[PDB]
Symmetry: D2
Subunit: 262 residues, 4 copies
C-alpha cells in the first residue's frame, strides 16, 4: 500500500518536530520511504538525530547550504549510504530578522543577498549537486508562501525570494523533466506578534475557517513526492484551507473579522 | 483500505473505461471507497453497470444533467442506498460540435447556452441537490482544462465554460467551506487513447503536449485518476478552491520547447520534422 | 483632441452620466473621438440623447442585447451614419451561488458574456484596421468577492472570451481587452462595505474615480495601446495586489483603526 | 494638453536609441515631460548625453547601480537641479552570459547574485534613494518579461530575477501608495532590431512571437514607449502594482497558433 515503499529521500531543513520538513518526512515514513536527513549545525543536530531515529533513519548529514564545501561530502554520503535518491525535500528559507520588519525599501543589499542565496540559490546548488543520484521518476519539492505573488504584511524580501523560488521551480521542471524528474512547490498557509495576527486572519477568513495542520502540509508534500503525482510538475500547490481564493475579507453583510470583536 | 476506506462517493460522467471519471473511480476503489455511479442514458448504462460491478458497486443511477426531473430521484436514491456522501466527482463537459468548429465569434446563442448549462450550471445543480447528504470533510471535484485561462485551438466556448467552472469552484469553496466541505478542480492534460487517435485535431494537441511538456510525455488516465483520488481523500484536507494541474508540467511553458542544436535554440517540434 | 481624432467609436451601456461607459466616452471625446451611443429602451433614450450631444454626438441607436432583432438595424445604422468603426465599448452589466436558478444563470451569461460575441460579430465587417474592442470586468472573476456569485462566473467567462476574441480578431489587426475596475463611490449596504473596504486596504488608500476608469479605457481604445491585446487591465488603486488586509508596528489592521 | 507637461522624470537605463528606456523617454518628451538621464560610465555618457540633449535635457548623471557610492550624489544632483521628481523609469537588467545559456542548474552563485543585484535590488536602492524627492502622485515604472512567470528558453536566472522584480513591484506599491505614489511593471514582448536579429536565439523567439501572437507582429519600441508613458502619466492614476503586458497579445496563447483548412489543423509555425 505504501506510496513510497522502498523509495529513498533526502529531507533538508528539519529544525525540530514542528518543522514543515518534519511533517513531510513523517508522512513519507508512514508511506514506507527510506529517509535521510541533514542538519544545519551542532545545535540543530541535537534535534535532527532523535527525529531521524524516530523515523527509522541512521542517515544524518551536515549541510549548511551557505558553505559550498558541504555539498561534495553530502553527495559522497548519499552515494555511499543510499546509492541513489527518489526524492528531495528542500525546506530552507532565511532572511535577517530586520529585513522582515518595516518596509522593503529599507532592505540592505547584504540582507537581500542572504535571503536570495539561502532561500533560492540553495535549491539550485542542492539539486545540481545531487542531480546524478536522482533516479528516473524522482521528485524534488520546495516550500513557498502566498507572499510570493500577493502582498502579505511582514514578508518584504521573503516575498521576492519566494517569487524567484517559484520561478526556479518552473525552470528546474524543464531542466529535469528531460530525465523524467519532477519539481514542484508546496505553498503552505500558516500553521499554529505578527504571526498570531496572520494565523487569526487566515483562520477567520479562509474558506475552511481553520488553519492548516502540520499533518495536512505533510500529506500534501508526500503526495507530491510520491508516484501518485507523476503527472504533476512545475506546480505551485496551495495547502492553505482555501485562503488563496479570497479576494477580500469573508463576510456573513458584515465582515466575519468584525463579528469576532463581538 | 487506504485513504477512502469506507468513504462514500458518487461518480458522475463515466462513459467507458477511458473516461476520466473511470480513472478517478478506479483509484478511489483501490483506496477502499464505496462507489456509486450515474449514467446519462441506456446506451451508456450498458457501460456504466459492468464498470460498477468491476469496482464493487451495486449503486447505479440515471442522471442526464439536462433534465431537472432526474435530480430529486438521484437524491432519493443516494439517501436510500448510501445515507450520506463523502465525495462527488463531476466529470461533465459538452458543447455542440459546431461550437468547437470555426471561431468563438460564430457561436450561436443556443450553442453558447447549452455549453454553459451542461459544463458549468450542472455542477451547481448537482451540488445543491446533494448538499444535505454531504458529510463533514466531504470533497467535491470537477474537471477542467488550460483553455479556461489561455487560448487553446478548437475549444472556443468551452474555454469560456471552463473559466466559469473554475470561478464556480472558488465560490463553492467559500459556500461549502463553512461546513468543512472542500471543492476543487483538476486541470488535465490530453490523454492518448485509441478513439482519440482517430481524430486529427486531437492528434495535434496530443503531439504538441508530448513534444513540449517538461516531462516529454502525455499524462496517463492513471495519473489523472490518482491526482483526483488525492483531491477527494483526506490527504488533501488542507486543499480547497484549488485548480490542480495534472498535465506533465505543460502549463509552465511560455513558448515551444527547444534543444540547443548546432549552437541555435532549435524547436523540438522542428526536429521532429 | 489627440489620440482619437477622426476615430469612430460605439459606446454600449450608458445609463446616465455616472455610467462607466459614460466616463470612457468622456475621455474619448476629450481625445477628439467621433462617438455614437446605444440605448437600452426609450426610458434610457431620454437620458442617453442629452449626454450624447453633450459629447457632440447625434448618433444614438437602440440596442437591447437580449433581442436579436436589434443587431442588424444597429449595423445598418452605423454603416449609414459612420461608415466604419475604430473602437467599441461594451459596458453591459446584469443578473449563494448554490441557490442560483438555471434561469438566472442563463440570463447572467447571455447578457454579460454572449452579448460581447453577438455585438462584435455583428459589427466585425465595419471594424477598421487597428480597431479596439473594450469590455468591463471585476476581480470577482478570479477571486471570491462577497455578493458577486453568478456574476463572478460570468466575468470569468468574459475574460476568457477576451482572450479567444483577441485571437479571432488579431488576424485582422483588431485588439480586444478588458478593463477590470475597482468599485466607484456614487451618491446599498453591501456596496458601502466593499467600497470602504477597498478604500482602506488598497495600496493607494482611495477608491478609483470615474475619470480614472475612463482614462484607462481611453488608453486601451487608442493607438497608445496598439501593442496591447488580450489584456485584463486593473484600474483599482492597486487593490488586486493585496493578499490580506492592510496593516500598520504591532500588527494592527488598518481596518480596525477606522 | 501633453500628458506629462511640467512633470519631471528620471530615466535610468538608456544605452542607445534602441533602448527601451529611450523609447519611453521619447514618448514622455512628446507629452511635455522634463527629463533627466543616467549613464553607466564614461563610455555610455557619449551616447546618453546627446540623446538627452536632443530631448532638451541638461540633466545627465552617472549611475552604475552596482556602485553604492553613486546613489547619494544622484540624490544631491536631482535635488539641486530638479528639486523633485514626478516619475522614475527603471530599465536595468543584467546576467552573466554563461548563465543565460545552458540550464538554470549550472548557474554559479556569483552569477546568480550579480543577476539578482543588478536586475532586482537596484530598483529598491534607486527608489529608496530618491523617495524623499518623489512628489504626490509620482509614478515608478520598471521593465519585465514573460519569463518571470513562464518558462522561456535561454532566460534561466533572469526568469528568477524578473519574478522577484514583479513581486517587488507589489510590495513597493504598498510601501509607496500610502504617499499616493504608484509602482508598476511593463512586461514587454521582444522587439526586432538590426543587431538583435543577428543573434540566432533572439531571432527564433522574435519569429515565434511574430507568428503566434494574436496580432501576428512584434511590438515596436514606440508601442512599448507609449504604454510606459501611459503608466507614468496621470492617465493611469488608478493603476498601481500592475504588470502590464505590451506584447501583441502573446501572453494569452496556451499553445502554438493553428489555422483550420479542409478539416485539418495545421500549426501556423509549420506554414513557414
Amino acid at each position: 500500500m505504501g506510496f513510497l515503499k522502498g523509495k529513498k529521500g533526502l529531507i533538508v531543513g528539519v529544525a525540530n518536530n514542528k518543522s514543515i520538513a518534519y511533517g513531510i518526512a513523517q508522512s513519507c515514513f508512514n508511506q514506507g520511504a527510506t529517509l535521510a536527513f541533514t542538519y544545519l549545525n551542532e545545535s540543530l543536530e541535537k534535534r535532527v538525530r532523535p527525529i531521524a531515529q524516530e523515523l527509522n533513519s541512521p542517515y544524518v548529514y551536515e549541510l549548511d547550504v551557505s558553505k559550498e564545501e558541504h555539498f561534495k561530502p553530502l553527495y559522497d554520503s548519499v552515494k555511499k549510504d543510499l546509492g541513489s535518491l527518489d526524492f528531495i525535500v528542500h525546506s530552507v528559507a532565511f532572511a535577517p530578522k530586520e529585513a522582515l520588519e518595516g518596509s522593503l525599501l529599507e532592505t540592505s543589499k547584504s540582507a537581500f543577498n542572504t535571503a536570495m542565496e539561502i532561500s533560492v540559490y540553495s535549491l539550485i546548488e542542492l539539486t545540481n549537486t545531487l542531480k546524478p543520484l536522482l533516479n528516473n521518476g524522482a521528485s524534488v519539492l520546495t516550500l513557498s508562501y502566498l507572499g510570493s505573488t500577493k502582498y502579505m504584511a511582514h514578508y518584504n524580501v521573503m516575498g521576492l525570494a519566494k517569487a524567484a523560488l517559484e520561478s526556479a521551480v518552473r525552470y528546474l521542471a524543464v531542466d529535469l523533466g528531460k530525465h523524467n524528474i519532477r519539481v514542484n512547490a508546496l505553498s503552505a498557509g500558516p500553521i499554529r506578534a505578527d504571526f498570531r495576527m496572520i494565523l487569526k486572519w487566515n483562520e477567520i477568513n479562509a474558506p475552511l475557517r481553520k488553519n492548516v495542520s502540520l499533518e495536512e502540509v505533510g500529506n500534501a508534500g508526500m503526495y507530491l513526492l510520491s508516484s501518485l503525482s507523476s503527472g504533476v510538475s512545475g506546480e505551485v500547490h496551495f495547502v492553505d484551507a482555501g485562503y488563496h481564493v479570497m479576494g477580500m475579507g469573508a463576510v456573513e453583510a458584515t465582515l466575519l473579522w468584525d463579528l469576532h470583536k463581538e
